Design a protein around this ligand. Sequence first.
Ligand SMILES: Nc1nc2c([nH]c(=O)n2[C@H]2C[C@H](O)[C@@H](COP(=O)(O)OP(=O)(O)OP(=O)(O)O)O2)c(=O)[nH]1
Ligand SMILES: [Ca+2]
Ligand SMILES: [Ca+2]
Ligand SMILES: [Ca+2]
Ligand SMILES: [Cl-]
Ligand SMILES: [Cl-]
Ligand code: NA
Length: 327
Amino acid sequence: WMPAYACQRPTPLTHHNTGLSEALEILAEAAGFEGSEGRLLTFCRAASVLKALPSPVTTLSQLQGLPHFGEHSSRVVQELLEHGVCEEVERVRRSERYQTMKLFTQIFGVGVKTADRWYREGLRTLDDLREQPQKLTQQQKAGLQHHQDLSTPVLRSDVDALQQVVEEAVGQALPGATVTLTGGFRRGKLQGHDVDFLITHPKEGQEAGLLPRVMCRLQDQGLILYHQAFERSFCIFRLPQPGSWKAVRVDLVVAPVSQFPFALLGWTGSKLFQRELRRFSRKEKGLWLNSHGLFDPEQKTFFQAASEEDIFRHLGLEYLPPEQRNA
DNA sequence: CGGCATACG
DNA sequence: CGTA
DNA sequence: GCCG
Ligand SMILES: Nc1nc2c([nH]c(=O)n2[C@H]2C[C@H](O)[C@@H](COP(=O)(O)OP(=O)(O)OP(=O)(O)O)O2)c(=O)[nH]1
Ligand SMILES: [Ca+2]
Ligand SMILES: [Ca+2]
Ligand SMILES: [Ca+2]
Ligand SMILES: [Cl-]
Ligand SMILES: [Cl-]
Ligand code: NA
């Protein structure tokens, strides 16, 4: 009854197994910090299964027959059910390796590979990094200077004012171009670590060269604290605050209107949902999906889509609104 | 055992 | 390498 | 770590 792919089931934002899913996601994160992407995926998938259940897991028996629950994830749930804590999870939580890899990977411009190298070099704190800044990229210097502001969640109540400033710049760059809020906010989240906007124009081709024009205008308005032809921009924006402002991460993405449903799907997430959707497409339907299109490699054709609904139908999946893609 | 999503900057 |  |  519980299908194996997260794109085959509704996953709401809030659910009935929060504590169990959070513990599995700690182990998933730690697996990623060690480069074990397969174990990260299994732990992420097991957590996601619990998010999709209709009521709390109260006894181990209820894991029987659920996909992605083997001996390891079942033992994690078992210990939480019996003692309220999982020793493995707590050992990870307080480990110096986990805490420092988390601290470092949270910096904009630092990935797992860089954080791991720093860890092996003996670095442990943000002040350790600030001491020899010539070792940092320009992106990493920005991420480090802005780290405190970037560590505070963006509120959905901040987003509308920001969307209006982006829309003004976009409308000057290309009258008729539109801005769509994507990411976790579109899935219903009340906060997020960054804001995501998808930009298009109803006349195919008119969006060509648009993003530099947008960025130049936003920069001239004094709103860009950091930015790098292009179609994705990963920025730090000045967001107004009472008597002041704060730095917020903002992603801007441009797509032609022909690709807009695919880009909207991809950027609306969740990350696990998109990975599972692309895996399902490829492995179950023989179709190749990304944020630009859906390719039939046998007939060498791209599927036209006018809506997200179209894409779910192409793939033979029941339609899920964004609020049920919180895998 | 092989596979694990798939892009752009 | 970083980013989504 | 788990599925097929
Ligand atoms: N972060 C991230 N997002 C990805 C990846 N691959 C992929 O398709 N995405 C898509 C799905 C994400 O939900 C969407 C937006 O990315 P995001 O990091 O802003 O995630 P979010 O809005 O869901 O989360 P948040 O800001 O509330 O923390 O981009 C990836 O590797 N990392
Ligand atoms: Ca099982
Ligand atoms: Ca976001
Ligand atoms: Ca983002
Ligand atoms: Cl592995
Ligand atoms: Cl893509
Ligand atoms: Na990072």
